[PDB]
RNA sequence: GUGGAAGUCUGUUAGAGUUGGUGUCCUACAAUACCCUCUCGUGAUCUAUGUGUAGGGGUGAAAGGCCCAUCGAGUCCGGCA
RNA sequence: GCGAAAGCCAAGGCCUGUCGGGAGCAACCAACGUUAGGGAAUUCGGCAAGUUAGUCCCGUACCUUCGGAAGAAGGGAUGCC
RNA sequence: GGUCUUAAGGUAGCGUAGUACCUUGCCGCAUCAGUAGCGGCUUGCAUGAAUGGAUUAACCAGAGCUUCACUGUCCCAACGUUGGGCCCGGUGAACUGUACAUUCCAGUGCGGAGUCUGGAGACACCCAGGGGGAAGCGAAGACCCUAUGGA
RNA sequence: CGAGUGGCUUGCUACCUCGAUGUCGGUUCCCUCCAUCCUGCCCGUGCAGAAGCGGGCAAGGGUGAGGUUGUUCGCCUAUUAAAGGAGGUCGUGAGCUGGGUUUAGACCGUCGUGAGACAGGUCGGCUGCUAUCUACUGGGUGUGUAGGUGUCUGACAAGAACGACCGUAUAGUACGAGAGGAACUACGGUUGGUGGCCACUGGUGUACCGGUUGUUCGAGAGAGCACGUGCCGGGUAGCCACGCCACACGGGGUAAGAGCUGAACGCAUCUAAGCUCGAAACCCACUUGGAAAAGAGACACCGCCGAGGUCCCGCGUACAAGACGCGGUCGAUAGACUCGGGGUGUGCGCGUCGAGGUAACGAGACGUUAAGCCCACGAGCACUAACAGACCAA
RNA sequence: CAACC
């Protein structure tokens, strides 16, 4: 009688192509209510290892007692706020108005773009002042990069550059709040937006698989017990009925798969720290040694190691926030075995 | 916790655990030892392990 | 249900044998079905670890066999992962024979059982001899 | 105990054959092939060469099977445009 | 080794079951290896795959034309010095 | 019915059969559940004695059913191996081709349209793919009917 | 009894196709319809409650596993919130299957003098093709917008990205004589779906280490062959699922429905104008794509004799070609080496022991020896190789 | 239900 079963994949991760941008964007941000902020950051993967926590959740009925829990570090080096760029409301959406940049740059921001050597902040910063008097400021930005020469781990030093937006209390506070960022050189860290134990949204272009079938792609059953020895294993049934005449983009095809942006959600930081602590016997596999700036993650994050990843305050976040949990042992057991 | 099989510690959050017919219990700290367990082998005849060192 | 207390691979599936773990004079169970539980097409209905099942006696007296009755599972091959980290398994596959309220029909429990059983089935667990 | 019978058993001995895969191939290696599995293998056995039976005729432990990729009547040419 | 069996090796023959170069060499296909727990739920059907396996000792039912059934079944043993 | 057609009027056996339409007949066995299978019953649509009946040890690449054992047949798929596939040098065919042709949704039309109508969409070219459509290619339908056709 | 709608069944017609549009059932994969089985929100009750029964809005999501039978259907079983129906050439054989149906062989019953017949039964019985166009899934090269780098915008586009259930508190409370027995709300978990990830568990792992059978190299040592590992045991990286992580609330507008104000019609009236509410449904929220959006976009800086780019070289976070990304002495990009971290399980040789044996000889045991062998990972280290050098460019 | 009955 043909029973029902729900399609094989999700049609909300189209078209799965190759990812236009290695560095992740993020198409949404928090809301404005505390007082003004950054509201991202970014980092490198560097690897997994466990932790043993002390149950925090106040309607759990092991509150209070020993919970392993598995955990990815991310090094989570300094960035540095390089810009203001300013966003006007128009017709037809927001639209870039000006930037106001600064004078000292990372000695290897040259290695990604033409660097200003002649910029004016006080005219930059006056037509921006202009367009919030006027009522047609949209929201405000910060041209970020990061500094990938702090990671040994990571060969690169080429600064990765995203744009993250500011939100917080009133636009002229934010807009100041803003301004004195840029200004002293743009250098934050990931203290200066999260606190262990908040849930943040990270994002990342997916471990690359190259093509691969509809089996593995969109997860359809291979032939089974007869019709799998014909001469068709991991080929689906047909391309669609006799009509419509014409095979719908809907049916389950093969193509790339991975290398895709990804945002997961609610993603709760166990541990933001700085040193070796994290770090795993003999290194993390494929990756290096960690000895700097790093964040837990509880779980997994979107990528294969070295890539960076990205943070932003969760926007959409089920549970409370249950501030610095209690770390009682971190595994630097070797991930090699 | 010690490895009830090699005699090394067991490195928190992780292992497995054998409940035996008679309700006994041994703590394996990985498959090796669990595989070799299997194979009727007693953890002091392999030099490899604590037990035997 | 009430949180189990540690996550199952079901280690079982509608049709599987497993040993009546007490002394009602059943020896062998069959699952039939698996309380609560709706799977997806050709998925074979799985149960595991603490799940409430209906079976059919296999193999028993003459009197407990081929009646279709309810049981719980206390003991599975497939390992279960505790909230240390730590996964548990058992030697073998087995079931205890429960009534209406879920109290055993029989007087004796034969070997071990999971302790998170017990969370669930308090009265099934107030018959064992050995709870790990 | 001896003896060593058998359209007797096992057997990819040689040799003969071909149940299933409805596998491979299906502009093929091949106008009937390939692989594994399978059956027979001292007998109504298998096999070489020679020889005989010829077309409404042969031959047929009979399937309308076979008589040179051709058979509910061969092939060739003629009747014939 | 029971063996004109397998497997390995001589004598002898060959590199001509005659296009090569390159990518850790993707999807997909042909052959094939290994798969936790469940164990035929798959399917018209256990199709396909697998299980068993050589030899010795013990032991062997219904039925029977007394030949057989039968290697029934089931159990144990097996190296080297 | 308690003979009549046309000679006799089915005996031993077997029986819902490789024969039973009714039919998944009824009872039982077995299974959680068995249009199956086996046993019994049996008025047999339409069994039956060399058109052989019944029965049967042994035999069988013959048909159906059950059990033990085992297993990727399945739950539900994974990883790996060899040869292809992909790129490069060389060699180098065939099938097929009225024309035009970037199509999609509806409609219309000999009622089953890439080509007509209305809209929608559509920058050109190329690589790989699995085959939805071209009522795809291959074979003057073997079915059915018709022929004062053949065998 | 009367009036209709549909085009799922059947019948009828003979319009299309006999120089062929492959025929049932199933399977796989995709879209859809609503006359709604569940889930959301309602109305009535012969509505105390719990639960039934009937009705309304509503197609977002779900609607599963098994026994007989080729079966569709149906009968049956245990689960379930429910295990709804239908369209797409009764969707789907240039996708699968071949049980049925549907040739040639054969049998039974019935029919026929016979040859032979039977949508009666029964056993057996073949499924071709290298994709030209179009369609779509993914990947490139060009042109257009009209020097370069970086960052964005968001017209459009896709989503189910989330659906459902159990349990606890509420509460043995409201209700009810009792029996029985709710809800709002707050919580914990499960299941189905979805995306991602490998610290943990599990699989693989013809890298690797070890054991061992036959044979060959005289023995030993060390090896080949036994199918692309002879067989067996363990197993790193990586890849994986059986493992692990994440997947709202809240707004806005409505339907059915509950109402407010309110007249036509002095009253009444939820409606005619106006308004307050109100569904899993609609829009937004969230995720993904997206300057070729022809109104072909915005901003900042760099450059026009030089910004930037190509070739070249060392490589992978990338990869079928192409593309993509990183590094190139202002350097740790790859290799060697040495450490670290891992796999296996104690090397060759020698010494002692060793059942015996005159002796020769001797399987094997212990020590040397956490040994030996090995590593797709990490660090250190410029030792080798990223050299030399060519070219485009407003 | 897949032609003939
Ligand atoms: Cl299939
Ligand atoms: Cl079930
Ligand atoms: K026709
Ligand atoms: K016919
Ligand atoms: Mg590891
Ligand atoms: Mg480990
Ligand atoms: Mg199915
Ligand atoms: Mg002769
Ligand atoms: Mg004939
Ligand atoms: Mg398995
Ligand atoms: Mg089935
Ligand atoms: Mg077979
Ligand atoms: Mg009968
Ligand atoms: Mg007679
Ligand atoms: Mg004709
Ligand atoms: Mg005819
Ligand atoms: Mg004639
Ligand atoms: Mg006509
Ligand atoms: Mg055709
Ligand atoms: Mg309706
Ligand atoms: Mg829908
Ligand atoms: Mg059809
Ligand atoms: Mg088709
Ligand atoms: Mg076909
Ligand atoms: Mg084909
Ligand atoms: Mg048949
Ligand atoms: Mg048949
Ligand atoms: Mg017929
Ligand atoms: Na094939
Ligand atoms: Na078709
Ligand atoms: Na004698
Ligand atoms: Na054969
Ligand atoms: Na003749
Ligand atoms: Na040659
Ligand atoms: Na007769
Ligand atoms: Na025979
Ligand atoms: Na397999
Ligand atoms: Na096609
Ligand atoms: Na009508
Ligand atoms: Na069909
Ligand atoms: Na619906
Ligand atoms: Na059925
Ligand atoms: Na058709
Ligand atoms: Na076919
Ligand atoms: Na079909
Ligand atoms: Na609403
Ligand atoms: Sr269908
Ligand atoms: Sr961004
Ligand atoms: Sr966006
Ligand atoms: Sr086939
Ligand atoms: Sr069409
Ligand atoms: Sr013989
Ligand atoms: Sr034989
Ligand atoms: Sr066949
Ligand atoms: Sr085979
Ligand atoms: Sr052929
Ligand atoms: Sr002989
Ligand atoms: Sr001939
Ligand atoms: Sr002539
Ligand atoms: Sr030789
Ligand atoms: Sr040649
Ligand atoms: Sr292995
Ligand atoms: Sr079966
Ligand atoms: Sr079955
Ligand atoms: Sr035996
Ligand atoms: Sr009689
Ligand atoms: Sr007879
Ligand atoms: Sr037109
Ligand atoms: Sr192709
Ligand atoms: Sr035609
Ligand atoms: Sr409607
Ligand atoms: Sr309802
Ligand atoms: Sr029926
Ligand atoms: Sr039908
Ligand atoms: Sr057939
Ligand atoms: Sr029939
Ligand atoms: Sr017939
Ligand atoms: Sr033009
Ligand atoms: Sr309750
Ligand atoms: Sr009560
Ligand atoms: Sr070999
Ligand atoms: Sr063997
Ligand atoms: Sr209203
Ligand atoms: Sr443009």
């Known amino acids: 009688p043909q029973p029902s079963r729900p399609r094989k994949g999700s049609l909300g991760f189209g078209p799965r192509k190759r990812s236009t941008s290695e560095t992740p964007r993020f198409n949404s941000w928090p809301s404005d209510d505390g007082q003004p902020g950054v509201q991202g950051f970014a980092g490198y993967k560097a690897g997994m290892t466990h932790v043993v926590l002390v149950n925090d959740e106040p309607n759990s009925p092991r509150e209070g007692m020993e919970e392993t829990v598995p955990v990815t570090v991310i090094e989570t080096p300094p960035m540095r706020a ?34 200003p050597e002649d910029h004016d902040p006080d005219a930059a910063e006056e037509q921006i002042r202009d367009a919030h008097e006027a009522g047609d400021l949209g929201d405000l930005r910060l041209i970020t990069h990061t500094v990938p020469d702090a990671v040994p781990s990571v060969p690169k030093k080429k600064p990765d550059v995203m744009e993250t937006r500011v939100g917080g209390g009133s636009v002229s506070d934010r807009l100041d709040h803003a301004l004195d960022i840029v200004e002293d050189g743009g250098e934050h860290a990931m203290n200066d937006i999260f606190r262990a134990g908040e849930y943040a949204d990270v994002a ?24 799998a020895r014909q001469g068709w294993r991991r080929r689906i049934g047909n391309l669609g009925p006799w009509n419509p005449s014409r095979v719908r983009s809907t049916v389950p095809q093969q193509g790339q798969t991975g290398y895709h942006q990804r945002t997961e959600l609610n993603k709760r930081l166990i541990d933001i720290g700085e040193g070796d ?3 795993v016997d003999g290194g993390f596999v494929n990756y290096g040694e960690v000895d700097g700036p790093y964040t837990l993650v509880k779980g997994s994050v979107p990528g294969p190691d070295k890539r960076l990843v990205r943070f932003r305050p969760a926007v959409r976040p089920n549970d409370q926030p249950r501030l610095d949990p209690e770390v009682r042992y971190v595994s630097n057991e070797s991930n090699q075995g | 916790r010690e490895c009830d099989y090699c005699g090394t510690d067991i490195e928190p959050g992780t292992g497995t655990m054998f409940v035996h017919k008679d309700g006994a219990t041994t703590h394996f700290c990985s498959s090796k030892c669990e595989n070799n367990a299997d194979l009727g082998r007693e953890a002091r005849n392999l030099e490899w392990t604590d037990t035997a060192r | 249900m009430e949180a189990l207390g540690a996550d199952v691979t079901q280690g079982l599936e509608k049709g599987s044998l497993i040993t009546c773990a007490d002394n009602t004079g059943a020896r062998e169970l ?50 279960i992962r505790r909230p240390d980290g730590t996964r548990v398994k058992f030697e073998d596959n087995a079931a205890v024979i429960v009534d209406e309220n879920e109290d055993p029909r029989g007087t004796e429990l034969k070997g071990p059982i999971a302790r998170e059983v017990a969370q669930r089935f308090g009265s099934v667990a107030s018959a064992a001899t050995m709870i790990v």
């Open chain 1, 82 to 115: 390089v810009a203001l760029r300013a966003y006007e409301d128009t017709p037809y959406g927001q639209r870039p108005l000006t930037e106001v940049w600064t004078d000292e740059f990372h000695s290897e921001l040259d290695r990604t773009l033409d660097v």
């Open chain 1, 204 to 227: 990342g272009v997916t471990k690359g698989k190259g093509t691969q079938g509809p089996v593995k792609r969109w997860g359809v059953q291979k032939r089974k017990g007869k019709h």
């Open chain 1, 277 to 279: 602590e994290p770090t």
């Open chain 3, 30 to 79: 069959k699952v039939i079905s698996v309380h609560g539980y709706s799977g997806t097409k050709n998925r074979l209905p799985k149960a595991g670890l603490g799940d409430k099942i209906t079976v059919s006696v296999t193999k028993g007296t003459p009197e407990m066999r081929r009646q279709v009755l309810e049981a719980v599972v206390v003991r599975q091959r497939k390992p």
